[PDB]
């Protein structure tokens, strides 16, 4: 598909169509403050091309939005390279949300989840987040319809044990939460339970093939999931390999090269030698 940059969508739905061809959002996705929107505005709205967000997903005050199952049906990975106060997923004051419905969400690399103050929000207790986040310790899921004993959650689905009891796991009435065998780890699997290639992230279109991932556990280059960017390529945005020229083009109106990475700024003890974008250490104290 396409790589789009981090987006900030407010007030009107008009700007939302900027995501239409998008596959990876390199940066964050914030959709917020839509006070005049109604359910009808979302009945026909879908971005099935979105597979991954490199930073974080934030939904706040978006009126008329009842589920995300149609909006982001194929979002599989949120990498959490940059987070919104320790969170890679924020669902806050989503007056009208009845369920999450992100049935393709397999992994949150990095972050934690904050789902707070959602009157109407159910299908939360049906989610085993331990399959999605390494650390659920820091999850802050409070003040939702779910807290007040009367969610009519209904799921065939695989059950998992979180407290002392086994509970069936699903996203909506019609979508189970996919659970891959223990041995697949984070790589994902096919319907038949066959593990995806070890360089894949949440799922694959074919098993045992690093060119057929729908994610990349490590880095992406020329179709394939690779463990590392080989030289002459540089690690970029913690998910893709680029050449020096790309990093240079960006810099020229402030990306720099350091430790085989194309980075926003030089780290501590270093300053930027102008002709080659390379971070070089400071002779005496650092000018800044």
């Amino acid at each position: 598909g396409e790589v789009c940059p981090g987006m900030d969508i407010r007030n009107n739905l008009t700007r939302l169509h900027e995501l239409e061809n998008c596959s990876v959002i390199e940066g964050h996705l914030q959709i917020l403050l839509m006070f005049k929107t109604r359910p009808e505005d979302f009945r026909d709205l879908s971005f099935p091309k979105l597979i991954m967000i490199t930073d974080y997903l934030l939904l706040f005050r978006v009126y008329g939005l009842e589920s995300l199952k149609d909006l982001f049906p194929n979002l599989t990975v949120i990498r959490g390279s940059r987070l919104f106060f320790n969170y890679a997923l924020v669902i806050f004051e989503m007056v009208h949300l009845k369920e999450l419905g992100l049935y393709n969400l397999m992994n949150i690399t990095r972050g934690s989840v904050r789902i707070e103050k959602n009157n109407e929000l159910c299908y939360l207790a049906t989610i085993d987040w331990s399959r999605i986040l390494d650390s659920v310790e820091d999850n802050h899921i409070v003040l939702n319809k779910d807290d007040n004993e009367e969610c009519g959650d209904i799921c065939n689905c695989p059950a998992t044990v979180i407290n002392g009891q086994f509970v069936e796991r699903c996203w909506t009435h019609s979508h189970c939460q996919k659970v891959c065998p223990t041995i697949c780890k984070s790589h994902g699997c096919t319907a038949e339970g066959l593990c995806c290639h070890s360089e894949c992230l949440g799922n694959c279109s074919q098993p045992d093939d690093p060119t057929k991932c729908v994610a990349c556990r490590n880095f992406y280059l020329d179709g394939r999931c690779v463990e590392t960017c080989p030289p002459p390529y540089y690690h970029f945005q913690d998910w893709r390999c680029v050449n020096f020229s790309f990093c240079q083009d960006l810099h020229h109106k402030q990306y720099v090269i350091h430790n085989n990475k194309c980075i926003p700024e030089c780290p501590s003890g270093y300053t930027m030698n102008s002709s080659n974008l390379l971070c070089t250490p400071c002779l005496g104290p650092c000018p800044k």
Partner: antibody
Amino acid sequence: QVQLKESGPGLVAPSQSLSITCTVSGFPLTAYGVNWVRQPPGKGLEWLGMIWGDGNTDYNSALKSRLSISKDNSKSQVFLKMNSLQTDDTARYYCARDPYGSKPMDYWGQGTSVTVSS
Amino acid sequence: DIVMSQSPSSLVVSVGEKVTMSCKSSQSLLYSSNQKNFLAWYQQKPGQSPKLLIYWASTRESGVPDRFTGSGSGTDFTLTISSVKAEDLAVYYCQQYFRYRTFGGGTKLEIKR
């Protein structure tokens, strides 16, 4: 199903060119690199060059423009061309896959023997 | 250009014994960004094509017996064969894949019988 096979001319007259086609299958040339390695009888392995997924080229410094590596992604073919061969270019020529970012040369062709004489 | 050099040119051992051969690169092959060494070891049985055994100087390829143990870092490397088996007879090569790719002169393994 990863396979590589070299189609060589077998015999090259001194001062003439060498053209070898490496026909690959089971993977896309768009996502993987292909190298060429030669082995003179009873001698070691010599790395000749590679072609990356993006068509970028790498050649052994010794090959002062005598070596050309090109490819046709749609036909899963990699082309080696070497100008003005001499007797010391008598060797077995192999094309080998390269999963560059992730692995070193995995999957070697059986090789094609090249003899330079008139 | 990166130059690779191996020793011995050849070695002989009987079945059951452990074997060690060495490699040297003119430049460091240890990648900063992940702390991995960009070196590989191949085994070539006579009459056959060479086979990948070890990459990242220590990572064993799938289908490779635990007998083969890759070692070393920076510019100097070694390949070890824990308990030589009859069919371990072959020429062993080191390859750098840090910048371009270059093979060492290789080392020949003979079996004492």
